[PDB]
């Protein structure tokens, strides 16, 4: 520890002027740089495609299907098993895929309703259930045929 | 040590820091609200600082001047918004008090704060200029404003001015040119009217102010004292 | 204060509504040692390597 005694030794001979090397890089900065306000990215720069496949997750181009713009359960009816029974395999497959697609759009919407607004209306849920029923019927018919 | 100043439930250094801080804040803002005790001690410091500044401004002795400056430096935290505070003290603050002998700060009792019941007070510099250009009014001296408000109220009611109010006005005047005072009052009054619902007739208001000033400026028992028989 | 609407000392927790609860409960991916690997019926896809990698089949 430092005390009354303390003889501080010098640093170094710092290699006499002539002996040093020239620095590999000479000119560094721009000694004149201004701090300018940032430049936030704008959407005008984009060209969002109209027929972009992710629009297929919405009904038409619409955030939520309004209560008026939903198919009411008075009109909509799920597919019957017997009726399905006389349908080709390919057609059945197509139907299934359509159903799935519909569910996805409902599903997203349903999630939005539940998580954010916190609604309990459950029209979307009901629709999804109906779709699921149809799907299961289809599956049953497929099994049955085999 | 015992009974020279308040202790404020803080050890020496911390207390000192607090008091200096308070002084600095007062210089910055002209008026502040705090606990009564803190205010009372803060005023002591601030007044002393002001007097030192005055002495520095006046005294011919270079040595004395330097010493006073040093003292002033010691008694402040010149860092953030107080960086130019030294300059301010000499150039702006101290001159206002050149003729006034002590009593540079004014402590006014408020209501005790609801949550803590701690007794509160306003601490403020006395003659602070109420009107800054490129700004309208300044964050100035509460007392003056209050007085003006009272006057306005009286006028509205068409009652005579309370003697106390008159006394206060006189006090305010003592170290103040008349015209300047009038101007200040006028400036206050318009603002007050705007704030309140009351209307504003300029000339009439001016006249009223003049009348008020005049009375202020030009001055005008059961026991019988008798010699021992 | 932790939360300024509760000034006084109540029977309130720093977070949540009760420290205790049933600890005997199926554990998920998030809990355990580094070595604890739960998995989520996602990859019986390829085969692990001798060295640590994964060769898809």
């Amino acid at each position: 520890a430092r005390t009354k005694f303390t003889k501080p030794k010098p640093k170094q001979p710092v290699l006499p002027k002539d002996k040093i090397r020239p620095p590999t890089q000479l000119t560094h900065h721009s000694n004149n740089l201004r701090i300018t306000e940032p430049i936030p990215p704008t959407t005008s720069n984009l060209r969002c495609p109209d027929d972009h496949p992710l629009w297929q997750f919405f009904s038409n181009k619409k955030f939520i299907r309004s209560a008026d713009d939903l198919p009411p359960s008075s009109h909509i009816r799920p597919w019957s098993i017997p009726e399905l029974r006389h349908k080709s395999f390919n057609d059945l497959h197509s139907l299934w895929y359509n159903c799935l697609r519909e569910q996805n759009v409902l599903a997203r919407e349903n999630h939005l309703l539940k998580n954010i607004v916190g609604s309990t209306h459950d029209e979307f849920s009901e629709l999804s259930n109906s779709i699921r029923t149809t799907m299961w019927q289809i599956r049953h018919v497929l099994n049955e045929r085999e | 040590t015992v009974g020279i100043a308040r202790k404020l439930s803080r050890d020496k250094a911390h207390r000192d820091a607090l008091l200096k801080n308070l002084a600095c804040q007062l210089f910055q803002h002209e008026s502040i609200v705090s606990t009564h005790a803190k205010c009372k001690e803060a005023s002591r410091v601030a007044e002393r600082i002001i007097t030192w500044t005055k002495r520095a401004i006046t005294t011919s002795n270079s040595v004395a001047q330097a010493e006073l400056k040093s003292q002033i430096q010691s008694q402040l935290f010149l860092a953030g918004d107080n960086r130019k505070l030294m300059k301010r003290l000499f150039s702006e603050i101290a001159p206002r008090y050149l003729e006034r002998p002590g009593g540079y700060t004014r402590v006014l009792r408020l209501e005790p704060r609801a949550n803590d019941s701690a007794p509160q007070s306003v601490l403020e510099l006395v003659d602070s200029p109420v009107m800054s250009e490129s700004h309208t009014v300044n964050r100035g001296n509460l007392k003056m404003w209050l007085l003006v408000k009272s006057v306005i109220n009286d006028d509205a009611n068409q009652l005579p001015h309370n003697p106390l109010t008159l006394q206060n006005l006189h006090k305010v005047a003592k170290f103040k040119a008349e015209a300047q005072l009038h101007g200040e009052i006028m400036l206050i009054k318009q603002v007050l009217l705007k704030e309140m619902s009351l209307p504003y007739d300029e000339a009439l208001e001016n006249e009223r102010t003049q009348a008020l000033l005049k009375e202020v400026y030009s001055s005008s028992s059961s026991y019988v004292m008798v010699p021992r028989p | 204060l932790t939360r300024p609407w509760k000034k006084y000392r109540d029977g309130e927790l720093f977070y949540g509504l009760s420290k205790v609860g049933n600890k005997r409960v199926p554990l998920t991916t998030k809990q355990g040692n580094k070595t604890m690997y739960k998995g989520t019926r996602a990859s019986g896809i390829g085969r692990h390597t001798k060295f640590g990698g994964y060769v898809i089949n």
Binding site: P40, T43 | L108, R109, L110, K149 | P4
Partner: protein, 112 residues
């Protein structure tokens, strides 16, 4: 260290409300405010008038709300894209409803 007996209703009453010291006095000391004839404590500035003055000062000595240079001409759609509003936690919500836990100064009666 410890009470020998349950302290009777009488005795506790007389300890508490008996003496003068322990009773709340009536605040006799209060008078009219010169600026607006409302009640105020004696030797004390009226809390309404002072508050008003403070407010006016604030309005006048208001600091310039340093709004950024970019966000002023930032398209609404663009803004939406950039900064979508999240759901705040319970705690945050609680904090936000200040009215629930925070008190505004009451006004006195008019003195007569």
């Amino acid at each position: 260290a410890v009470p020998k007996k349950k302290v009777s209703h009488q005795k506790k009453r007389q300890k508490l409300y008996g003496p003068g010291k322990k009773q709340l006095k009536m605040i006799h000391h209060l008078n009219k405010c010169p600026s607006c004839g409302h009640y105020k404590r004696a030797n004390t500035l009226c809390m309404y008038c002072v508050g008003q003055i403070s407010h006016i000062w604030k309005t006048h000595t208001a600091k310039e709300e340093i709004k950024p240079r970019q966000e002023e001409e930032l398209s609404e759609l663009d803004q939406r894209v950039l900064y979508p509003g999240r759901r705040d936690t319970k705690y945050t919500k609680d904090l936000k409803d200040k009215d629930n836990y925070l008190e505004r100064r009451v006004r006195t009666l008019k003195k007569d």
